[PDB]
Design a protein around this nucleic acid. Structure first.
Length: 75
DNA sequence: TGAAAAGGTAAAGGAGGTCTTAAGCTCGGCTCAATTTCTCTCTTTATCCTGTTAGATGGTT
């Protein structure tokens, strides 16, 4: 039960293991997928002048709402 | 009826206000160089935004 705040942040950091290069490549692919999906949604926002619903966004990707949502989560 | 006793009138003179000029000034207008604002352009910075590919991976006092 330390009072220092920086040391607590450093401990919280140390509870996470460094990535490996293959892990970086794998995560980078999912990040790119998320970015493209976000760009599409942004297009729906311009078309709808409102936030698209997950169903409309899933419809914009021709994807089942479950599959789409899980892909979004992974990203 | 005579006689105070007050009340008038017509002057002279003064006191006071109101007019007239010779001397001088200074004051505004008029011109006319001689310039400070103003308002456009025409730039020229002042400020903000985005990106950067060797590898790096837990503090100092």
């Amino acid at each position: 039960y330390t009072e220092d705040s920086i040391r607590l942040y450093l401990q919280e950091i140390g509870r996470i293991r460094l990535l490996r290069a293959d892990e970086e490549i794998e995560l980078a692919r999912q990040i790119a997928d998320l970015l493209a999906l976000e760009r599409i949604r942004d297009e729906l926002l311009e078309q709808l002048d409102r936030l698209p619903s997950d169903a409309e966004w899933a419809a914009a990707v021709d994807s089942p709402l479950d599959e789409f949502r899980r892909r979004l989560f992974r990203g």
